[PDB]
Design a protein around this nucleic acid. Structure first.
Lengths: 1326, 453
DNA sequence: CAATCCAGACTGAGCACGCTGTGGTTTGGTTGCA
RNA sequence: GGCCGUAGUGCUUGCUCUGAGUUUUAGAGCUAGAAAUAGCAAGUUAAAAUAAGGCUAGUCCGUUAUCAACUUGAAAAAGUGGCACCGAGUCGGUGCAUGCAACCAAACCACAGCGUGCUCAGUCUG
DNA sequence: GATGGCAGAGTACTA
DNA sequence: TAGTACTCTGCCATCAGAGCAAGCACTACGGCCGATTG
């Protein structure tokens, strides 16, 4: 047995580890090897790293599940429509639906006529000539009044139902309101008629252009207000206009209503809101509100319709037909123009599907943007194409009916068209008249988001409860699904449990019991002092009850003056009163009690005890439910208790928020001795006046015992469940689980003796989003910088360009305009200096013409600059270009700047880890490692867990020449773990007073101490520290510069580090989601069981779960002889279950005969094989391999590469370049090492020759450039999948090992989580 | 001529013995006891042939009879210290732990020779052959003892139980003692003058004159003849002044030491290993009663005896070895203690080692009875010289009690520490009771003593 | 009035380690005689 | 530093929805040519599928997490591998692993006395 | 984004 | 010579939205909270 410490470093896809002794020396022991090879033992250093693929979130799985559910529901809608139509469809055409179902079928496979609608070619051609598109048929059905074919009626209705539209706008829409200016004039006329005191005229104002502008709604409101005299914003007219355009205006200022009176036109509660508002204010404003509603409908419709509706009842269909006609006319004109002006490109434009143009636009896969990009130069270099270019610029040239911009069509337009069709056609078909309501319900029914899936107990995502067991259809959804209980379950299944009482659910935040509990908790910890009192008293239960009943239940917020006057002076009759322990105004107050008092108007009911259940139910309903309908249906049982008006007010009132304490903990549990609850104890507990924490921590009472019994009940879950319940990124959670497993394995390895200390560290850790953010900011601010020079997302990916665009093209510190073309010449300066903290985000980075404009570089920008540009920064913040945090950091100078305490805190938090995830990791490790208690049931800290930040190790490496290069190999993870262990152990040995802030368990003076915390390693600081360091007050040596640095250097230069790639069975998608066209190949996968790939297309590139080594016999040649074969078979994800069910049958089906179950070997990804000369390969797939060896470059070469390459960019720097110049001849040795390693392992002859030729040709370049490019050459000799790299201009492609034949006679190695335990299986024997 | 007169008493003519007075004895067992069967342990071919003649003769006498029993113990031969007779031993290891325990009444060798008075100068030592086989064993307890013996020549294979008391049994020495004592108890009454000493089987007859011994020997032979016990005639010293008994020479009423025993101690060369030194110590220790101040003489060799140590035979160790070799060359003649007369003990203590001599009156001179020497305990080692003598007397007085048979004795020492015990300047209270008991000990006139004594 | 900045000693209890004395089990050795 | 309150950002989980995209089929191509071929015309839409599929038959579920080898188990799970030193090109080598009595020594348990350090309560001081 | 699948062109060995 | 059969090289990967609810983690802002010294 020997004392040792375990050092760890945790990453998203790597967990290094290292075991050290008391002298900072990595041990080494012989490990037995199992299997069947001749080798029986192996020596390994106790240092290594584990590599694995990064974890993934469930966002993609959730999206896929939602898509599946949506497709299923769409098919169900189609089935409902067919069931409605079937009885009459049988008479009209019996096999119509059958023909529709088999449209996706070749002529031979079809059991009916290939024509799906009428069944004969004459009628098919006639119908397609009469109605070129479905919109023609829809408009004809809407407009015409004669009898129509039932098949055509069903086709139009089915198209409308299948493609409904967005449900963003609630309520109802009437498409008859189309014009904008005329409706605005009509609204102005109503305004003048009603409010005749002051005239309102909008003559000579381009209302249509102002309102239909693409700018923001607020910008449009401001423009309309400015271009209208006699009124301003927040007026009655301004509020009406804001409500019409979409903004939510407060109508209190318009009528002095003293309530919120906020209306949103799109919301479903607008009806009730307007009803109560009109009841309060009078009915004369109903005309104005209706005019505003009509104006809003016209404004929202004119964006998409763009067609008059006085001649037709199908505006969307008419617009689609107009687009079709414009496409036809433009196509004919373009055809004629090309044929006449330029006949040299007619074939490539109108016939070549490979290139863009009309052929690639229609027949090919080219998009509208690509077509426009291809046809813009051709259109410009022509004659008589001015209108065509105008249409192209307006994005209205040769538009298909079904486009990506069709996402703004509400479902109300389709509903109106369907209603018109049904109304027209209901005369001839009685069943259409009888089923109109249910067809409309089919079109306009959606499952509420709180109901969730309509399962029957076989779903883990469902919570809906059913009041009946019949099948749920849209026509009995209300009669079957329990909406209120479903919504309650939806909210409750996500809310948190009580931390002190896990078993019970937490109370609502605004609960009356919670408010009483908080008020009493704050009240019991106060002490009053009056004349003639020797010692302060605690305001015992009677006084507390009097104070509660006379102060909190009468005023919203309680103050000390009111406490002294209304109670102490009035009742206690003590003029001199000295309260203590509380501020001027109490924090907690009965907020909910006062809200109900002004509504129910019953003090006796509010004070009575037997209705506390009713009050809790009311507040629970208000917190749980968001929709007015469910609130009302839940409060129906209480209709008897309160009159209709009070009921309506209660429905209107809504609370948000949930508490952290359970009702059982607050009031249910009672003390065993006297049967008193926590609330009763707070109300009166002798004269001690204990609070909640004292009550639950008191040993005499049984509260602690009851809490411990409940907490123990259920028992801690598994480690996997604990890590899953932890909050953080899935990659970090996977790293934590792997770290725990490697810690357990190391403890088992080292003689089952726990380490003295454990040191851990964890690393800290879009163009389209940036584009949408800048678009929103530009629209809000009204600027035209984007219009001046459009910028693509790839261009916006540049940091400097992004900063310039966010700053609106202006300097952040002076009132000047910067030039986009003159970029790459200014400097980017962080708001907070880089010395204080490490943060390179956009939230802290600011681009300015000159970094000197801020003034001092050691603090927040100058007060003069802050005062100069505070207005501009406020405008940018209101434009959402900058964040609230960025604004607060920028304007810190006015608040006072960075104080010395702030500087000290900034420098302290750099060396100390404060992350909740790291705290959780430390807690888990401590709980697992230490499990022995003491005589007083106190845990003994057998193992100490220390958390450090990466700054200490990075500074150690930089200061003492332990430079790290990440491109050499993967040994840097193990080196980081070892250095973390060494630094942590040395720190805790040197400073035992710092255990609180590191081990899990003055301002000026505090500054310099933290800055010089790592000085005891240094020799010359000119102060000369002793060579041997000591703890102080003890005879313990914590460092020895004579030999400990040499020991660290020796450890960092060991050529043996246990690097292990975690083998994983691939899971996920079956194959690539792309559907390829039909082709003669066996690689295609059928999309359905009956769909032949060679006739219908299918998927390709299946994902292999795990390879299987099978030894069997196959039939080769016409003789059908059995040739023994040993080969790797890739079991894809789709067939994994079938292979597991019957491996024998699965293998025999593929063609193998006489397989061997014993010889069957399952090989997941990253399986390691040892071939010869130490050459290792990892199984990438069934027919590919990966590199599996690491290059142990000498530390001298690593340091030279770092110093020459200038990683992370006076006298100290002067000697570095001199050292590099002296050691110029190291580049040849590095190249020789790379070449010999490649020849021994990589075996890429052509790539190595190309690399050597490039290096020889680039021998005259400077040493800095040469080393920086030599760093790239290590991609050739790396671990993992081959990758392409670059040496100066020359580029080198991948060398892929696409053969797995040689690994069938190699040695297969099974490695544990640390790699010290192995099982070498020789495959040549098989 | 002795053999002819008493054919029923000598083993060479009387044949096998059988106690005609003692009844068959049942060997009891504990309440929680079960039969145990142990296979016969492997025995070398040379040791097997040693016992084989005994089994053949034991079968004829009826001592060993074939039987079938669940009890079985492995036979084991033990060769005599002389020749290769290979006496038969049953090796009842398991039975001893299972058989009940009785209070031993065997006499310890220290106290037998104390009963011999110097007045009785004529001796007659008779040793009973096959002593333990005389007592009959009840057939109920016969299955308890058994062993496996298979010889193709004999033609009988199986267990052969014992009809008499076997050898190697833990209760055999005790059961034979009581049985023989009762039979000879009647003999003691008839002859008050004779002094009969009994040690398991060895009998010693002490008489005043030659005629008294001759008459006593005939009566003893006749008494033992009727009782069935047979005495060996090959080794039976009858009516001789020089006799050997209990390993001690008896001449002129003095407990001499055999010349052969002295040769063995000196004959061994200088020890070289702790085992070699341990062997020599025991020989010297058995003679400790003759060597004056043996505790201090062999003091240097004691710390070398420890199992954990280095055997460094230094000059001091060689000096201790030479002292013991020369002391045994001129060992004196220890006299037989006479219980009628009072005893006298000299006590001296130098350097933490107590030495002394127990003497008795012989005319005008004092004759040594036994040389007493001891090592003081470490608690008394650090005491001052005045207090060390008090502790030395208490240790030596305890040793004298085991030989004086509790008779009063006089403690003589150079100093006058006898008054110091009354008024010394837990253990001390224990020492006060031992030294102030006027019934058993007293202090005579204070006087020094010669260093040799 | 405004802003900035626990340690030691003694007493009582539980030990825990080192030394001395007694009691007891068992192992080596020593003879004796069995 | 701590608390209380709030304003914002980011991330995670779950639910309800929309627009496209892809694939097969339908939308009769014409003329001159034996045939390839050439010249014109046309192009905008619709049906079905959107992980194969499963049984639990629901307007449900099916891409997250977890997973070296061997033994014991239905399974959940539990077990399986010596140490030190000198070295270093992916780890190597060396070395170790029958009975009786009394007296003396090692070690063990229990108790009594002395010296000394750790933990808890109290007091005082700073 | 990167790594494994896949089609196609190319070269090689045997019936 | 025809037919498999293995190897190297370049192309290619479904994408965009809209709401709701709960939780955690971190970042600023306002207000507190004591005692001592200048």
């Amino acid at each position: 047995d020997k004392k040792y410490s375990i050092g760890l470093a945790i990453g998203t896809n790597s967990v290094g580890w290292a075991v050290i002794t008391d002298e900072y020396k990595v041990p080494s022991k012989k490990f037995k090897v199992l299997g069947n090879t001749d080798r029986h033992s192996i020596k390994k250093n106790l240092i290594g790293a584990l590599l694995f693929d990064s974890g993934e979130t469930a966002e993609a799985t959730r999206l896929k599940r939602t898509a599946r559910r949506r497709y299923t529901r769409r098919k169900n809608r189609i089935c409902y429509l067919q069931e409605i139509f079937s009885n009459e469809m049988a008479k009209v055409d019996d096999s119509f639906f059958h023909r529709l179902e088999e449209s996706f079928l070749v002529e031979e496979d079809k059991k009916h006529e290939r024509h799906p609608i009428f069944g004969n070619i004459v009628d098919e051609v006639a119908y397609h000539e009469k109605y070129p598109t479905i919109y023609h048929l829809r408009k004809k059905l809407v407009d015409s009044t004669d009898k129509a074919d039932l098949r055509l009626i069903y086709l139009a209705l089915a198209h409308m139902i299948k493609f409904r539209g967005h449900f963003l706008i609630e309520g109802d829409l009437n498409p008859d309101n189309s014009d904008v200016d005329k409706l605005f004039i009509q609204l102005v006329q109503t305004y003048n008629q009603l409010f005749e005191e002051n005239p309102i005229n909008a003559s000579g104002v381009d209302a249509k252009a102002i309102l239909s502008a693409r700018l923001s709604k607020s910008r449009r409101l401001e423009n309309l207000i400015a271009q209208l005299p006699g009124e301003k914003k927040n007026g009655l007219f301004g509020n009406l206009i804001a409500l019409s355009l979409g903004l939510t205006p407060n109508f209190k200022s318009n009528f002095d209503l003293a309530e919120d009176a906020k209306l949103q036109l799109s919301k479903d509660t607008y009806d009730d809101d307007l009803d109560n508002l009109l009841a309060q204010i009078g009915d004369q404003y109903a005309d104005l509100f209706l005019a505003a509603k009509n104006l809003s409908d016209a404004i929202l419709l004119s964006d998409i319709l763009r067609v008059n509706t006085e001649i037709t009842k199908a505006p969307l269909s008419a617009s689609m037909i107009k687009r079709y006609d414009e496409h036809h006319q433009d196509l004919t004109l373009l055809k004629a123009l090309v044929r006449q002006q330029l006949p040299e490109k007619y074939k490539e434009i109108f016939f070549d599907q490979s290139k863009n143009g009309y052929a690639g636009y229609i027949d090919g896969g080219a998009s509208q943007e690509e077509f426009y990009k291809f046809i813009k130069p051709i259109l410009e270099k022509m004659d008589g194409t001015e209108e065509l270019l105008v249409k192209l610029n307006r994005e209205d040239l040769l538009r298909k009916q079904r486009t990506f911009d069709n996402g703004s069509i509400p479902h109300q337009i389709h509903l109106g068209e369907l209603h018109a069709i049904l109304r027209r056609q209901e005369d001839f078909y009685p069943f259409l008249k009888d089923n109109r309501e249910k067809i409309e319900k089919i079109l306009t029914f959606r499952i509420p988001y709180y109901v969730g899936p309509l399962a029957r107990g076989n779903s883990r995502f469902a919570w809906m409860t059913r009041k009946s067991e019949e099948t749920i259809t849209p026509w009995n959804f209300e009669e079957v699904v329990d909406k209120g209980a479903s919504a309650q379950s939806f909210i409750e299944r996500m809310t948190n449990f009580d931390k002190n009482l896990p078993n019970e659910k937490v109370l609502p935040k605004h609960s009356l019991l919670y408010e009483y509990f908080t008020v009493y908790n704050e009240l019991t910890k106060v002490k009053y002092v009056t004349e003639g009192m020797r010692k302060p008293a605690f305001l015992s239960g009677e006084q507390k009850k009097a104070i509660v009943d006379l102060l909190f239940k009468t005023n919203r917020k309680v103050t000390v003056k009111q406490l002294k006057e209304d109670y102490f002076k009035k009742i206690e009759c003590f003029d001199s009163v000295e309260i203590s322990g509380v501020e001027d105004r109490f924090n907690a107050s009965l907020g909910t009690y006062h809200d109900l008092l002004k509504i129910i108007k019953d003090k006796d009911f509010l004070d009575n005890e037997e209705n506390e259940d009713i009050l809790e139910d009311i507040v629970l309903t208000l917190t749980l439910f968001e929709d007015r309908e469910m609130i009302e249906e839940r409060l129906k049982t209480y209709a008897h208790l309160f009159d209709d008006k009070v009921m309506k007010q209660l429905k209107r009132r809504r609370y948000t928020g949930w508490g952290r304490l359970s009702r059982k903990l607050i009031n249910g549990i009672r003390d065993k001795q006297s049967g008193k609850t926590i609330l009763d104890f707070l109300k009166s507990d002798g004269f001690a006046n204990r609070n909640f924490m004292q009550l639950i921590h008191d040993d005499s009472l049984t509260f602690k015992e009851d809490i411990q019994k409940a907490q123990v009940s259920g028992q801690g879950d598994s480690l996997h469940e604990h890590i899953a319940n932890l909050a953080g990124s899935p990659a970090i959670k996977k790293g934590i689980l792997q770290t725990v497993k490697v810690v357990d394995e190391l403890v088992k390895v080292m003689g089952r003796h726990k380490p003295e200390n454990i040191v851990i560290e964890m690393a800290r850790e879009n163009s389209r989003e940036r584009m949408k953010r800048i678009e929103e900011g530009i629209k809000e601010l009204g600027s035209q910088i984007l219009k001046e020079h459009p910028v693509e997302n790839t261009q916006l990916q540049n940091e400097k360009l992004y900063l310039y665009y966010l700053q609106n093209g202006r300097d952040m510190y002076v009132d000047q305009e910067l030039d986009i073309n003159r970029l790459s010449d200014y400097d980017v300066d962080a708001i907070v200096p880089q010395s204080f903290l490490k943060d390179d985000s956009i939230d802290n980075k600011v681009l300015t013409r000159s970094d000197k404009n801020r003034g001092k570089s050691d603090n927040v920008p100058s007060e003069e600059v802050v005062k100069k540009m505070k207005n501009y920064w406020r405008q940018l913040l209101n434009a959402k270009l900058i964040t609230q945090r960025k604004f607060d950091n920028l304007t810190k100078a006015e608040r006072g700047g960075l104080s010395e305490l702030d500087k000290a805190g900034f420098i302290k938090r750099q060396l100390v880890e404060t992350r909740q995830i790291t705290k959780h990791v430390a807690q888990i490790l401590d709980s697992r490692m230490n499990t022995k208690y003491d005589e007083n049931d106190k845990l003994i800290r057998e193992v100490k867990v220390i958390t450090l930040k990466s700054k200490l190790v990075s500074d150690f490496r930089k200061d003492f020449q332990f430079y790290k290069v990440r491109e050499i190999n993967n040994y840097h993870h193990a080196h980081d773990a070892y250095l973390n262990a060494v630094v942590g152990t040395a720190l805790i040995k040197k400073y035992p007073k710092l255990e609180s802030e590191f081990v899990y368990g003055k301002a000026t003076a505090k500054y310099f101490f933290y800055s010089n915390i790592m000085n005891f390693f240094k020799t010359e600081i000119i102060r000369k520290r002793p060579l041997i360091e000591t703890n102080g007050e003890t005879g313990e040596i914590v460092w020895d510069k004579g030999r400990d640095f040499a020991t660290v250097r020796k450890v960092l230069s060991m050529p043996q580090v246990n690097i292990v790639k975690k083998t994983e069975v691939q899971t996920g998608g079956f194959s690539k989601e792309s559907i390829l066209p039909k082709r003669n190949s066996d690689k295609l996968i059928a999309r359905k069981k009956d769909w032949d790939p060679k006739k219908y297309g299918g998927f390709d590139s299946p994902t292999v779960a795990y390879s299987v080594l099978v030894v069997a016999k196959v039939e080769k040649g016409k003789s059908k002889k059995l040739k023994s074969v040993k080969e790797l078979l890739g079991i894809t994800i789709m067939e994994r279950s079938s292979f597991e069910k019957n491996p024998i049958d699965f293998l025999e089906a593929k063609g193998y005969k006489e397989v061997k179950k014993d010889l069957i070997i399952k090989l997941p990804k990253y399986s390691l094989f040892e071939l010869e000369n130490g050459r290792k390969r990892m199984l990438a797939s069934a027919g590919e391999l990966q590199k599996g060896n690491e290059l142990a470059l000498p530390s001298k070469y690593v340091n030279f590469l770092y110093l020459a390459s200038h990683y992370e960019k006076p006298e100290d720097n002067e000697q570095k370049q001199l050292f590099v110049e002296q050691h110029k001849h190291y580049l040849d040795e590095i190249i020789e090492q790379i070449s010999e390693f490649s020849k021994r392992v990589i075996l890429a002859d052509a790539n190595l020759d190309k690399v050597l030729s490039a290096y020889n040709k680039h021998r005259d370049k400077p040493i800095r450039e040469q080393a920086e490019n030599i760093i790239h050459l290590f991609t050739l000799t790396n671990l993992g999948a081959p990758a392409a790299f670059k040496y100066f201009d020359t580029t080198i492609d991948r060398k892929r090992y696409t053969s797995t034949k040689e690994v069938l006679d190699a040695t297969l190695i099974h490695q544990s989580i640390t790699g010290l335990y192995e099982t070498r299986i020789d495959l040549s024997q098989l | 001529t002795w053999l002819s007169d008493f054919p029923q008493a000598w083993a060479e003519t009387g044949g096998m013995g059988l106690a005609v007075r003692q009844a068959p004895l049942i060997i009891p067992l504990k309440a929680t006891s079960t039969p145990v069967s142990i296979k016969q342990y492997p025995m070398s071919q040379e040791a097997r042939l040693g016992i084989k003649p005994h089994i053949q003769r034991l079968l004829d006498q009826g001592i060993l009879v074939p039987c079938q029993s669940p009890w079985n113990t492995p036979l084991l031969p033990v060769k005599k210290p002389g020749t290769n007779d290979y006496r038969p031993v049953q090796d009842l290891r398991e039975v001893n732990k299972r058989v009940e325990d009785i209070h031993p009444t065997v006499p310890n060798p220290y106290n037998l020779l104390s009963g011999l008075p110097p007045s009785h100068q004529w001796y007659t030592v008779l040793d009973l052959k096959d002593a333990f086989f005389c007592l009959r064993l009840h057939p109920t307890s016969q299955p308890l003892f058994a062993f496996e013996w298979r010889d193709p020549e004999m033609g009988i294979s199986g267990q052969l139980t014992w009809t008499r008391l076997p050898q190697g049994f833990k209760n055999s020495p005790t059961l034979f003692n009581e049985a023989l004592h009762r039979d000879l108890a009647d003999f003691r009454i008839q002859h008050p003058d004779l002094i009969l000493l009994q040690y398991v089987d060895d009998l010693l007859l002490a008489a005043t004159s030659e005629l008294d011994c001759q008459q006593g020997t005939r009566a003893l032979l006749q008494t033992l003849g009727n009782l069935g016990y047979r005495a060996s005639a090959k080794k039976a010293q009858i009516c001789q002044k020089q006799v050997k008994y209990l390993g001690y020479l008896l001449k002129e009423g003095q407990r001499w030491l055999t010349e052969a025993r002295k040769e063995t101690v000196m004959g061994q060369p200088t020890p070289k290993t702790p085992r070699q030194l341990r062997e020599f110590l025991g020989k010297a220790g058995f003679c400790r009663l003759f060597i004056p101040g043996f505790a201090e003489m062999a003091a240097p060799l004691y710390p070398l005896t420890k199992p954990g140590t280095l055997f460094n035979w230094g000059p001091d160790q060689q000096k201790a070895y030479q002292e013991i070799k020369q002391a045994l060359l001129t060992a004196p003649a220890l006299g037989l203690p006479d219980l009628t007369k009072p005893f006298e003990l000299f006590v001296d203590e130098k350097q933490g080692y107590a030495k002394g001599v127990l003497t008795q009156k012989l005319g005008p001179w004092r004759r040594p009875v036994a040389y007493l020497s001891k090592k003081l305990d470490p608690v008394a080692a650090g005491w001052p010289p005045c207090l060390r003598m008090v502790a030395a007397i208490a240790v030596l007085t305890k040793d004298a009690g085991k030989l004086t048979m509790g008779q009063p004795l006089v403690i003589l020492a150079p100093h006058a520490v006898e008054a110091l015990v009354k008024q010394p300047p837990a253990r001390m209270t224990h020492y006060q009771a031992l030294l102030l008991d006027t019934d058993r000990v007293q202090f005579g006139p204070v006087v020094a003593l010669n260093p040799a004594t």
